[PDB]
Design brief:
Elements (H helix, E strand, L loop, with lengths): L2 E6 L5 H16 L3 E7 L7 H15 L4 E9 L3 E8 L3
Parallel strand pairs: 1-2
Antiparallel strand pairs: 2-4, 3-4
PDB class: ribosome binding factor
Keywords: IF3 C-terminal domain, ribosome binding factor
Assembly: monomeric
């Protein structure tokens, strides 16, 4: 019933990704929605592309238990995705 936040770095390394992925699946299994957010520092030309790619990886890795309620999108200097549990 909650919206739990999972924060991702644009420079995110493999173990931190898996740790965040574990946490997201844990929230979703508990019936809570997940807002996965990337807060961009600076204006790299490649930010939207990699933020998209990091969140798409999270979304596909949770497809077995979640639906995408809000597909990756910008909110100022942030990009976010909302996943909702398939069942509850």
């Amino acid at each position: 019933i909650n919206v739990k936040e999972v924060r991702l770095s644009p420079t995110i390394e493999e173990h931190d990704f898996n740790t965040k992925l574990r946490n997201a699946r844990k929230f979703l299994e508990k019936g809570d929605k997940v807002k996965a957010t990337i807060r961009f520092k600076g204006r790299a030309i490649t930010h939207k592309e990699i933020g998209q790619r990091v969140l798409d990886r999270l979304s596909e890795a949770c497809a077995d238990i979640a639906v995408v309620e809000t597909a990756p999108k910008m909110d100022g200097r942030n990009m976010f995705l909302v996943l909702a549990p398939k069942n509850d």
